[PDB]
Design an enzyme around this catalytic site. Sequence first.
Site, PDB file in Angstrom:
ATOM      1  N   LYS A  21       0.916  -1.165   0.036  1.00  0.00           N
ATOM      2  CA  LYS A  21       0.041  -0.010  -0.011  1.00  0.00           C
ATOM      3  C   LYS A  21       0.879   1.255   0.012  1.00  0.00           C
ATOM      4  O   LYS A  21       0.448   2.212  -0.841  1.00  0.00           O
ATOM      5  CB  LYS A  21      -0.878   0.040   1.090  1.00  0.00           C
ATOM      6  N   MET A 102      -6.078  -6.288   6.652  1.00  0.00           N
ATOM      7  CA  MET A 102      -5.472  -5.134   7.454  1.00  0.00           C
ATOM      8  C   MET A 102      -6.506  -4.198   8.260  1.00  0.00           C
ATOM      9  O   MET A 102      -7.515  -4.586   8.106  1.00  0.00           O
ATOM     10  CB  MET A 102      -4.614  -4.555   6.359  1.00  0.00           C
ATOM     11  N   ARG A 336      -3.568  -1.314  -5.712  1.00  0.00           N
ATOM     12  CA  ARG A 336      -2.652  -2.521  -5.343  1.00  0.00           C
ATOM     13  C   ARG A 336      -3.275  -3.546  -6.736  1.00  0.00           C
ATOM     14  O   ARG A 336      -4.473  -3.499  -6.953  1.00  0.00           O
ATOM     15  CB  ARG A 336      -3.003  -3.004  -4.261  1.00  0.00           C
ATOM     16  N   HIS A 454     -16.192  -8.601   2.749  1.00  0.00           N
ATOM     17  CA  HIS A 454     -14.980  -9.180   3.150  1.00  0.00           C
ATOM     18  C   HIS A 454     -15.127 -10.750   2.577  1.00  0.00           C
ATOM     19  O   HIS A 454     -14.032 -11.271   2.194  1.00  0.00           O
ATOM     20  CB  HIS A 454     -15.093  -9.283   4.517  1.00  0.00           C
ATOM     21  N   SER A 759      16.310 -40.122  -6.128  1.00  0.00           N
ATOM     22  CA  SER A 759      14.938 -39.540  -5.765  1.00  0.00           C
ATOM     23  C   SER A 759      14.987 -39.468  -4.574  1.00  0.00           C
ATOM     24  O   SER A 759      14.771 -40.309  -3.738  1.00  0.00           O
ATOM     25  CB  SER A 759      13.805 -40.787  -6.249  1.00  0.00           C
ATOM     26  N   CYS A 826      10.346 -35.957  -4.982  1.00  0.00           N
ATOM     27  CA  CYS A 826       9.064 -36.945  -4.651  1.00  0.00           C
ATOM     28  C   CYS A 826       8.272 -36.533  -3.700  1.00  0.00           C
ATOM     29  O   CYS A 826       8.546 -36.500  -2.531  1.00  0.00           O
ATOM     30  CB  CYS A 826       9.306 -38.410  -4.582  1.00  0.00           C
ATOM     31  N   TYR A 846      14.034 -33.268 -12.343  1.00  0.00           N
ATOM     32  CA  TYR A 846      12.631 -33.285 -12.390  1.00  0.00           C
ATOM     33  C   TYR A 846      11.920 -33.175 -11.083  1.00  0.00           C
ATOM     34  O   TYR A 846      12.687 -33.347  -9.959  1.00  0.00           O
ATOM     35  CB  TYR A 846      12.296 -34.630 -12.985  1.00  0.00           C
TER      36      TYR A 846
END
EC number: 2.7.9.1
Lengths: 869, 869
Positions: A21, A102, A336, A454, A759, A826, A846
């Site tokens: 902000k 906030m 924002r 809200h 792994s 994993c 990976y």
Amino acid sequence: AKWVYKFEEGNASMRNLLGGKGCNLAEMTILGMPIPQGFTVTTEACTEYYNSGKQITQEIQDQIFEAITWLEELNGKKFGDTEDPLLVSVRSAARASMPGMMDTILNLGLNDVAVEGFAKKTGNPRFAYDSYRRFIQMYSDVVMEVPKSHFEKIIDAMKEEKGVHFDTDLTADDLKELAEKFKAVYKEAMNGEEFPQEPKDQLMGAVKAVFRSWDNPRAIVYRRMNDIPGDWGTAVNVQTMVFGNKGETSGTGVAFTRNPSTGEKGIYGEYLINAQGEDVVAGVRTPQPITQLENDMPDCYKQFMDLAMKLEKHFRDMQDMEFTIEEGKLYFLQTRNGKRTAPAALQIACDLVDEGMITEEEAVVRIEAKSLDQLLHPTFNPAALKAGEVIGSALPASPGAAAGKVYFTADEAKAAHEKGERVILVRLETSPEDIEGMHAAEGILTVRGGMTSHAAVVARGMGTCCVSGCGEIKINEEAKTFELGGHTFAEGDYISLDGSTGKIIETQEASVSGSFERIMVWADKFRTLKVRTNADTPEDTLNAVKLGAEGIGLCRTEHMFFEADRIMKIRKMILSDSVEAREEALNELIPFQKGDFKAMYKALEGRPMTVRYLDPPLHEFVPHTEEEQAELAKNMGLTLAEVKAKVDELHEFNPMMGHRGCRLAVTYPEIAKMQTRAVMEAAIEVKEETGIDIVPEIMIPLVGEKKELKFVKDVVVEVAEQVKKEKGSDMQYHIGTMIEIPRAALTADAIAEEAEFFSFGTNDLTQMTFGFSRDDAGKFLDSYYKAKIYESDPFARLDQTGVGQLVEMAVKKGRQTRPGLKCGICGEHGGDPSSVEFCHKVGLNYVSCSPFRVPIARLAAAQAALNNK
Amino acid sequence: AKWVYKFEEGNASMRNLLGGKGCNLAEMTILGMPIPQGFTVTTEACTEYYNSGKQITQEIQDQIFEAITWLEELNGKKFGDTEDPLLVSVRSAARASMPGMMDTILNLGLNDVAVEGFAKKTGNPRFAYDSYRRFIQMYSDVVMEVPKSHFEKIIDAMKEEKGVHFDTDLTADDLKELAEKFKAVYKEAMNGEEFPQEPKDQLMGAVKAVFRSWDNPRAIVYRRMNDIPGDWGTAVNVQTMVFGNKGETSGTGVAFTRNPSTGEKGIYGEYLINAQGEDVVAGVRTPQPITQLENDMPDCYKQFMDLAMKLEKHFRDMQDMEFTIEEGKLYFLQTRNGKRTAPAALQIACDLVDEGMITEEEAVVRIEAKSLDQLLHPTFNPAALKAGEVIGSALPASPGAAAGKVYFTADEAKAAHEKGERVILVRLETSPEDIEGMHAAEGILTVRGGMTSHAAVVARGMGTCCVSGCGEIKINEEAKTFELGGHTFAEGDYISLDGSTGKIIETQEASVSGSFERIMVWADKFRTLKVRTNADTPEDTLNAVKLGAEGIGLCRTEHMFFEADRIMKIRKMILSDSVEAREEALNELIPFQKGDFKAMYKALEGRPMTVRYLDPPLHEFVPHTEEEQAELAKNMGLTLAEVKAKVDELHEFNPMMGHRGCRLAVTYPEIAKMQTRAVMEAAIEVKEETGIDIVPEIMIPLVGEKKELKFVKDVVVEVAEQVKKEKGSDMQYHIGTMIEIPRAALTADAIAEEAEFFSFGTNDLTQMTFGFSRDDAGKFLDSYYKAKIYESDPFARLDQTGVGQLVEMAVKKGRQTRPGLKCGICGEHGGDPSSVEFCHKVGLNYVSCSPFRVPIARLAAAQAALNNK
């Protein structure tokens, strides 16, 4: 020094100083836009208040008051002056946007005296007094002396005794009386602490309350639930007040440049005329579409749109803005980047790319990957929806098809279990204190606010479904029941969605937009990590490949031994006393298991699959009920006694660290011989019947020593080499290991001598590094979060400081001996964005997660590369 | 190249090439002593045979045969020649001495033909044939074609059919017939494999058998039991044969320059005239004191003594020697530093220091510290010994007062449990295959050998008690009973000792010589590590201080909560539902616990004591029998149901990794508040009543995160600070932590921010690093040793490659943040010599073990410094 910054003394870059902000107010100030001048007390000052015993120091007080003098001098009024007071809004700003969380106090600086001086200077008594009744309420709430319950019970009954329907109808008198009632509620629901009259005490108490609030239990649960670190701290902005409650030509509202629910380009939002946004748009008195503002104040809508467009073009992303119209003068009190729904984020990302505003790269790094979980959320079955009994309709706050039981308290919404007992939160309005129940519910059903309410806001934030502003829900908590259409529910079942409709519904699974495919497509062009799934079923494999999985990082073989038509063979084996007898029991499984593998190899079509050897202690396969043990003994010629004793002898104190994984294959290599055959024979066959090459990946679980691996490896290689009798078979195969034991990582350079791939099973690795079983940890883990000992759940988010080091040393050391060693993670961590960046940075090849997290890991791996190059 | 070394081509330095025996034969050759020339096949060649598929390669065969040609050419005979054969002894030599374990074949190179050529060349048919009956037996044993059982049944019945009492009485005929019977036993207890006639096949098969033997299950158990690594390998020495079976003026024997049982200076040992040592001294036909050899062959005894003295002076340590007298010509076939009994090692160490042969340093580095366990072994109660029914008497092979049940097989000696069921092994003679039962027994009772017998030798090696050569024990295994004096036992109870006497006895504890004190004294002057004990009782503290403990590294506080008169308060607490109620239950313990601490602080007199906070999960304090749970419910006003459910709710899957240690203090800081009070109040008081300063060391168990420690630390500091109300108390105190979780070590630089000291709990640290619970690990751990996966028990010997790295990184990283951080190890590893050297080298400050291991750690810490400077 420099605990306070004027708006002009800032820029968007100093976001951690000035909070989201703050740097935005600064930025805009810089942009030359119509924002009430003001100053920011740094996030640093939050750290200072805290790490300094929780006391706003001298240098802070003075630095604040100083800027106050600036403001007075600036906009020629005196702070909390008797005749012409200077009023300010105090609103907290985290480095991270936390919509709905906030604190904001408006009209700050008014006392029993200044409310009249303000009234005379202004000539509008109802205004000054409304702004005082409002300030007493907010300060008592935000600085927390007493709750909105008390306050509205008063403003409300007054409206209902005085024949008035809208507080907008109370008069200068009612309002001033009401201020007295509220200031009663304060002192009368406390010690007998007079409501701060001293503007300066009001300010400091506001400031403190905001710093203090940062450690409130709710802030903590939200921070964990949103991966926000408590090292951050909140900034507090103090701005010269602008009023939308000045009258009929004033108003306030929340607008978003693009629909935050859908992504649709064009203004979305709401407003209320003669109201303060910071409390009366975000709630009651049905707010009006920000589009209707063209009808009321065409002069303002035109200036507003252009300014909104300029902010979007400027921050190159959809802006969530708060503006106020002070008698035909428009001010922006905030922008924002809007927090969006996942479909939204995707839609906005594509449009800005097509619109030429942002590049693919920015589009990728912009989606909160963790939110993609929404896209694969069950939608409603359309035919169940057609025959759906629509008890009601309201605003489509956040998308989703939610159905579940109804509960009237966040607590009871949470205690009926999180997103697992299909809980539906039925409230009037939700509040920060409802954060956990909301987050646990399938959808939220609210009785009053709108799109900017809200509940709308928070829900869209969490991808939860929400229908706000259902005026006809007559709720009774003492009875815990509610009225809708021709019905009354009592914590029974309900269903609802973003088509706004609410009904008395079979959900299924759903389509994935082209913005999803377009994003996922861009993801793929940037990510370097490959994404494999954890699937031991071909249905799951196809589902995972469909979403982008490039193979299987973990096919567990346990189901092949547990399945009814097979469990008896392993049970036979377990109660056998002879390697030849176990071998026999084992051999019977080969046809069943080899069968499971072919179906997997066929589903996979060439994609690699890492197969994991038997992981669990034998005890898991033995029955532990004497009914079932009496059944087994019978189908074995054993006495219940001998089976019961055989089972007892397998029992362990710590099952997570007993005789399991590779250990069983060292004492029972027959398990491993039988598994390698089932695997190798399966592969060669599908390779036969298809011509598509397969390079099996055999993974030995729970390794802690290179000789321990080598031992089992030998048995694996020999059988694999023997199975290649379907032709001496040309078939290649990789023997690797699950690094899930610290020793494995510590001695990874020796383990790599025998392992072709590593792994990382981080769930168990975490469990050994930390010293706790995930199972037994919940009995103390909440206390840890509550105590800020742990900010993240170590089981969902990879602990990079501790467990992270072991992973990173296993990779570096494994690659000293095997330069080309493949490494993949994993588990739950594989589908976690931060765990994935670490892995990208640490060098894994990976990642592997559930079939539903593949899109997250795909996106996260692209953000990791983009964030790293 | 160089797989073979002549004796002269070696030196004592190349012990790992040439093995203990090898470099010693070499050394002596160099010394110019009377040893039959020969050559050594390197330990390298053992590694080669193995790591090359188990085949004596070309370069080995050739290198061996080559040296054979050398020998022939050397001592003008031809290897396995028909008329004058060259005979050799083949005996294995590990880098490490392993008395009673290695292999020796003598008279190698004799065939059906050469035995006659040898007979004619020699003119002594009984000799040639005895040496053949002997060679057939040894080769069949060592190269293992068949066992000594078969062989002696023949040589024996012959003696008992032919009216002959000693095989020394068989004639050239009997012996040659007997050779036929034995060569029958061979081929007839196998395929129909003719006993190798080809000297060269005999040699190679000997060589192979020796390499092969290195991986025999027994070698493995002995290697683990003696900390010998299987990376070593055995060398094989081949020497030109010398004969003690040549006749009445020939003989052989085993002598030790100092008594290996006691340390007494002067020749100790035995011999047999007209016999081969390598099998007939180390067994039957009661051997004669090597001192009687002065009577028979004064010419030889005089030359022998002087040569023995010269070897002791040369290697500056007591020598264990094997010599042979070939018709009045003495040869030495072997030396090695004798393996001694602990009292012996101590005694020999002092004498060589006083005698001026060695320095204190050498004396310290020389005692096998692990053997000091003997010195603190219960001796017999003298009055129980006075009223002792002495059923017999024999040779005092190794010292000790042993008492226990009798068993006739090593297997059943081991299955009655190791050194825990007071097992006594009653045998005729023990053999390598008895290694585990012997080692499990309290003492060994043998029926035939003497001081140099297998049982004497092995036992003294392991500090076990042994009475050898008890000719009157008539044993019957089929019945498993034995006759002694006027009694017959059947696996019943027996008792015996080094006073030689054997009886039908209350043991106590014993004195520690002055050589122990002199050694321990020298130890202290060299060691830099401090030695603390693990004692939670003052009796134990005094015992530990007495042996050299400089403080307490671990006082566990569990007994203070378990003790009958206190357990109910923690049970009260556990079933209480209110912090105020637990606090109450807790507070009641303060007087009991503070009481335990004062008594400890008083026993300690200033020495530091590291106090450990509650470690175990609460479940341990709750009763789990419904009798006991029904008792508790009653003394609480609870229904058995509510207690039973309270207990069930505390239950965990993995108790080693659940809610315990610091975790409990985070959810129940009251435990920690109450413990800090008990501790602090205790200390201040004893400080009061004594004037002796105390600096409490508070240790928080199971820490994995710096914030987790800090949390509990805070509670500790506040209470400690509050307790200092016995005066604002000047009392200092150190808050430290047990590093027993990998995370603790990984993040040790952050943990050190709050911890003043690190105490490594390596037992649990090992358990988490390795992935296994010590409890459940035994069900697969033997298989691991059997498979050579693990050479050492990770729980007794610190794993330096894996767990060792975590310790070493915790120290380095802890000391980055806290340069002066103290570090001590805790546990079984603290009393382990190799764990202690690592700790000395890694930089720990002290070590801590049971009160009985303090002398070991004291000695080990001195050897670590001496070995390291």
